[PDB]
Each structure stands twice: as structure tokens, then as C-alpha cells.
């Protein structure tokens, strides 16, 4: 029962996404990005958007920027609910997944009522968003946000201090700070080791500069610490979502350059 | 601005407190209370056939080709729905109908190829091809999923009333 | 409190016509609840909406036997609901 | 609500009392109306068999002062 060497094999899901894009136009390659990592459906689009906007030296209108940060964060929650609850299902805790997949479900509905698709929206396009938010979404992205916290709190009362979660997670996969930068970890994995780097604060993109959030840095980096970090960004994203609802500007959602 | 998620005397009171936590499993009992609590909450599930999960007007669902109220099919075979389809799903070949008008002899959406992006809904100038609300079109055989003009036109006629209501609700937004 | 809970259960059971009528609703849906009848479409179907129930279950359709002569009483199908009433069921439009 | 987990339990409970009531009445009916005597040590058997030898061919049959 001891692992001497792990050689992960990859490509069981290689599909050609990088070659296929060369044969497609910029707007018809946007749907590929949603599929690249589809737990995080939109946040991925924003990266292509930004990239295509830079090449054109065009920037999205003010309302679109806030939207992208609004749905950018909602998407972060969606990913963390996936990562924390799926982590537990493999560990053996199954009730957190059902608790938070109901909240996920409710979020998907935001996607659907904004894009049309539950996931794989194609809403964030290279020049802003595709269509303004439906007349009424903001209010519901509030009711949900107003409550989601308690739902994160519950998971906590079940796992953060479980006498057993800690054991299987604490002091497992500790990664040094120097080694994390060396192997290009660049994520919570770095942040969990105590390196302070959030590309959202260091190199602001969209209007993530106009919001105020706290990066959840960690010490004694290990599976448990990073987890705590992911639960904390779920918390911090609710702080960013609140603001976006409180301060989203009247305006157009796509560049005016036909 | 950063925050330390987990960054951190021994008194009988303290220790006795800590020892009781290990000995009588106090925190474990805390976790049981949470699940007992929900057992008493109303379940969120819906009777699937009887009650349906809500989908708003922009839901893309299943492809349909609309017709003008008069009865003339909207498509005029400009074929840019074919041009912008990301998956190469739509195949269109056309010829001037005897009327002299321009119509598609063959319009084939391969739904297995289609990834339901909804750009075709976007691209059409006459808005002849629309993303219809229905999502329940699972089929026993692969061939049934390939759709020619007659199935889509028939799909259009069946769901035209709701498609018209859905487009009515969302056109100002577009 | 719970006695009123019990009276609500009794009214739900009495609500679906006779003992045989609720047995019919019991077997095909497995859920007994009483709601105002919004409409009956020409294909046999009956639709009920209750404001009190949560968003997922406040609108339900009780399917009817042979809506195109198919013996549909037991093999209930989602597609049976007509296109006009499909959006009402899925909450696409509030209006019946 | 949670009202529904009860149906199933009812059929478990009912199926866990049967055994205890059953074993404890198929004893009081196959031992002449009296608990089935428990022969744990030689002496309890002796008196049990002595009694058999006392009358009829079964122990529950208990001859009294009028014998």
C-alpha cells in the first residue's frame, strides 16, 4: 500500500482543440474555450475574449466588463463547489455534494437565463457580452448570494473540522514554496504554500481592479490548507458578486465597432 | 489585501476541553446534527414527468425552421447559417424554385454534429432557423437524429406558437 | 399544529375524487397534492399550479390515458404535453 | 417531507417484532401453556426429566398435591 512512483498518463481526452481552432474563425472558436475546462465554463471564455480584444486593441464597454466579473465570479463558486464536493465524494463524504449541487443547479439557471445554455453558454464573446442581462436577473443573483453563505457554512460544520477530514487531508501533498513556483503550479496550489499571487490583484483584467477582495493565502500548505483556501475564495467571490450587483453601470454590453 | 486561512496556553480548562473533544467525539456529534437538521427540510426534487425544471426564453434546445404567417418558409438560402456553424452541422444546397424565388432544396442539420451553440439562431437574417424550446428529442436510432428540411419544418410547425412567444420575449434584448 | 398537518393529509387524500381516484394518482405519479386546475388541453391532459409549493414543483401536469390512443396511462412521456402548454409547465411564461 | 421514510421502517419494525413475539408464543404453546423450561445445569435437566418420568410423557404436564 505504498506508492513508489506515479506516472500519470494523459491524452485520454485529447480531442484536437488546438488544431481545430486554426481552421475556424475567431467567433466560431469561442465555443471551444467553454469546453476546454467546462466546470469553469465562462472564466475560460474571458481569457480568449481578452486575448482577441488585445490583438484588436478594442476593449469591452463598461457594463460588459462588470458582467464578465459578475459571471466570472459566479463561475468561480461553481468550480469550487465542484472541487470541494467532488474531493469529498472520492474521500467518501457524499452529503456535501448533494447539498451544494442544489446551489450549483440554481446558479446554472442564471447561466441559462442569461445565455440560453445551462453550461457551455458562449455568452462572453471577444468584444463584450452577447446580450444584456435579462430584466430581473440581478435581483435573483442577489437572493441566492444572500443565502449561499449559510450553505458554505453548513459544508463547513460537516468537513472543516471533522475529526476525520483533517486526518486524510492534513500533511498530505505538502508542496514547498520554491518548488511550487519551479513546477509552474500557479494557482491555489501556489497560494496554499503561502506565495502571494493572484493575477487578479497583481495584473488586473476587466474591472476586477475596481472591486475589493482578499486573496486567501495559506500556510503549512497541504491538502487541508488549500481546501480552506478554496472555501475562502467561495467566500471572497460572494464579496465581489455583491459589489458587482451594487455597482453595475447603465450602458451597452458590446463594443460599438460593427 | 491578503488573508491567512490557517495561520497559528496549555491550561487544564483548555486541555480538559481539548481532551473531551478527542475522548467523547464532540465535533463528530456536531456533524451528525447538521444532517439530522436537513432530514427535516423539504426535499428539492421535482416529479420529472409531472413537473419540469424551469427554462427561460433563450433556452436553445432543439432546432426548427420557421415559416411566414402566410405559409412561405422563412429561409431564403443565404447559407451563412452554414458558414457560421462551428461544427459543420448544417448542409444547405439551393436552386431557384419555379416561383423564381430562392429556396433550399436540401437543409440538413446533423444534430449529433451540432453542439447547440445558438449562433445559427443569431446569424439568420430572416431568422428562419431558431433554437426551439424542446430538449426532449432522444432517439432510438442514430439516423433519426440527422434531420432534413421536412423534419425541421415539421418541428417548426409543431412548436411555432411557443417559438413565436419566445422570440417575442427576447428580441428587444437582441 | 401536527393535527392540522394530519387534516391537510386527509384533505389531499379526499381531494383526488374517490378512494379509487387517488389510487390512480398515487400509482402513476407517487405524489398526492391538491391544486387549482389551470386548464385541460384538447389532447387529454390536466394542469394544476399551487403558489404555496416551491419553484420546482408549483406547476405540475397530470397526464391522461390515450392522448393519441397510445395506452399512455402507465408509460407516461414528457413529450406528451402539447407545445402551447410546454412553456407554462417549464415556467418559460407565467401566463397560462 | 421526512414523513415518507416511515413507510419503509414500519415494515422493518413489524418484521423485527414478529420474531420476538413468535418465538415467545410458539414456546408457550409447544410447552403446555408454560414457558419452555431452561435446562442450563444437570440438576435442571434431572428435575425436567424426573418430571417427565413422573407423569404422562411430557414435562409441562405437572402432577400436584392431588397425586
Amino acid at each position: 500500500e505504498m506508492v513508489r512512483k506515479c506516472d500519470p498518463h494523459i491524452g485520454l481526452l485529447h480531442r484536437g482543440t488546438e488544431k481545430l481552432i486554426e481552421y475556424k474563425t475567431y467567433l466560431q472558436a469561442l465555443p471551444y474555450f467553454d469546453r476546454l475546462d467546462y466546470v469553469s465554463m465562462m472564466c475560460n471564455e474571458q481569457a480568449y475574449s481578452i486575448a482577441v480584444e488585445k490583438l484588436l486593441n478594442i476593449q469591452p464597454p463598461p457594463r460588459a466588463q462588470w458582467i464578465r466579473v459578475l459571471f466570472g465570479e459566479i463561475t468561480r463558486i461553481l468550480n469550487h463547489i465542484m472541487a470541494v464536493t467532488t474531493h469529498a465524494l472520492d474521500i467518501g463524504a457524499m452529503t456535501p455534494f448533494f447539498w451544494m449541487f442544489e446551489e450549483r443547479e440554481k446558479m446554472f439557471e442564471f447561466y441559462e437565463r442569461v445565455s440560453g445554455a445551462r453550461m457551455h453558454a458562449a455568452y462572453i464573446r471577444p468584444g463584450g457580452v452577447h446580450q444584456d442581462l435579462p430584466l430581473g436577473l440581478l435581483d435573483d443573483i442577489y437572493e441566492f448570494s444572500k443565502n449561499f453563505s449559510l450553505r458554505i457554512d453548513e459544508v463547513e460544520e460537516m468537513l472543516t473540522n471533522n475529526r476525520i477530514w483533517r486526518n486524510r487531508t492534513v500533511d498530505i501533498g505538502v508542496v514547498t514554496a520554491e518548488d511550487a513556483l519551479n513546477y509552474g503550479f500557479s494557482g491555489v496550489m501556489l497560494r496554499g504554500s503561502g506565495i502571494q499571487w493572484d493575477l487578479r490583484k497583481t495584473q488586473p483584467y476587466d474591472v476586477y481592479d475596481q472591486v475589493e477582495f482578499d486573496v486567501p493565502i495559506g500556510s503549512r500548505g497541504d491538502c487541508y490548507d488549500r481546501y480552506l483556501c478554496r472555501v475562502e475564495e467561495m467566500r471572497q467571490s460572494l464579496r465581489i458578486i455583491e459589489q458587482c450587483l451594487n455597482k453595475m453601470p447603465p450602458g451597452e454590453i458590446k463594443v460599438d465597432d460593427a | 489585501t491578503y488573508k491567512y486561512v490557517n495561520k497559528k496556553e496549555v491550561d487544564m480548562k483548555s486541555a480538559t476541553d481539548n481532551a473531551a473533544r478527542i475522548l467523547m467525539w464532540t465535533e463528530l456529534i456536531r456533524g451528525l446534527g447538521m444532517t439530522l437538521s436537513y432530514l427535516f427540510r423539504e426535499p428539492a426534487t421535482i416529479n420529472y414527468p409531472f413537473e419540469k425544471g424551469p427554462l427561460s426564453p433563450r433556452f436553445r434546445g432543439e432546432h426548427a425552421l420557421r415559416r411566414y404567417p402566410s405559409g412561405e418558409e422563412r429561409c431564403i438560402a443565404c447559407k451563412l447559417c452554414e458558414a457560421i456553424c462551428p461544427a459543420q452541422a448544417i448542409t444547405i444546397e439551393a436552386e431557384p424554385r419555379a416561383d423564381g424565388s430562392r429556396r433550399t432544396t436540401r437543409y440538413d442539420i446533423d444534430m449529433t454534429k451540432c453542439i447547440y451553440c445558438g449562433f445559427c439562431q443569431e446569424a439568420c437574417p430572416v431568422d428562419a432557423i431558431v433554437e426551439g424550446p424542446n430538449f426532449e428529442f432522444s432517439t432510438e436510432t442514430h439516423e433519426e437524429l440527422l434531420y432534413n428540411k421536412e423534419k425541421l419544418l415539421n418541428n417548426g410547425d409543431k412548436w411555432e406558437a411557443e417559438i413565436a412567444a419566445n422570440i417575442q420575449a427576447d428580441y428587444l434584448y437582441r | 399544529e401536527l393535527v392540522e398537518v394530519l387534516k391537510r393529509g386527509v384533505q389531499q387524500v379526499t381531494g383526488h375524487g374517490g378512494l379509487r381516484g387517488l389510487l390512480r394518482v398515487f400509482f402513476r405519479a407517487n405524489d398526492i397534492r391538491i391544486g387549482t386546475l389551470v386548464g385541460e388541453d384538447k389532447y387529454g391532459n390536466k394542469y394544476y399550479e399551487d403558489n404555496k409549493q416551491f419553484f420546482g414543483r408549483h406547476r405540475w401536469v397530470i397526464y391522461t390515458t390515450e392522448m393519441n390512443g397510445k395506452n399512455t396511462f402507465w408509460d407516461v412521456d414528457g413529450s406528451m404535453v402539447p407545445p402551447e402548454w410546454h412553456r407554462w409547465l417549464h415556467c418559460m411564461t407565467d401566463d397560462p | 417531507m421526512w414523513f415518507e421514510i416511515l413507510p419503509g421502517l414500519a415494515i422493518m419494525g413489524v418484521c423485527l417484532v414478529i420474531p420476538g413475539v413468535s418465538t415467545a408464543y410458539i414456546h408457550k404453546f409447544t410447552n403446555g401453556g408454560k414457558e419452555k423450561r431452561v435446562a442450563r445445569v444437570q440438576y435442571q435437566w434431572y428435575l425436567m426429566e424426573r418430571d417427565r418420568r413422573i407423569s404422562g410423557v411430557n414435562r409441562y404436564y405437572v402432577s400436584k398435591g392431588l397425586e
Binding site: - | 439530522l36 436537513y38 427535516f40 427540510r41 428539492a44 | 399544529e1 416551491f54 419553484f55 | 417531507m1
Partner: peptide, 28 residues
């Protein structure tokens, strides 16, 4: 909802916080 005021209190006591304020049943 439809807590009846006793299942709700068992719910509140077991959870340790008020779920009534942040319910799982979305309403109008």
C-alpha cells in the same frame, strides 16, 4: 418550509443557526 414550529426548532437546534432565514425552497 411548512416547518410546523417544532420540526423547525429541531432543525435550528441540530444545525445551530437559522435555516428559516436562508431556506432551500425558493419562493416567489
Amino acid at each position: 418550509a411548512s416547518a410546523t414550529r417544532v420540526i423547525q426548532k429541531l432543525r435550528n437546534w441540530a444545525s445551530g443557526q437559522d435555516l428559516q432565514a436562508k431556506l432551500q425552497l425558493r419562493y416567489q
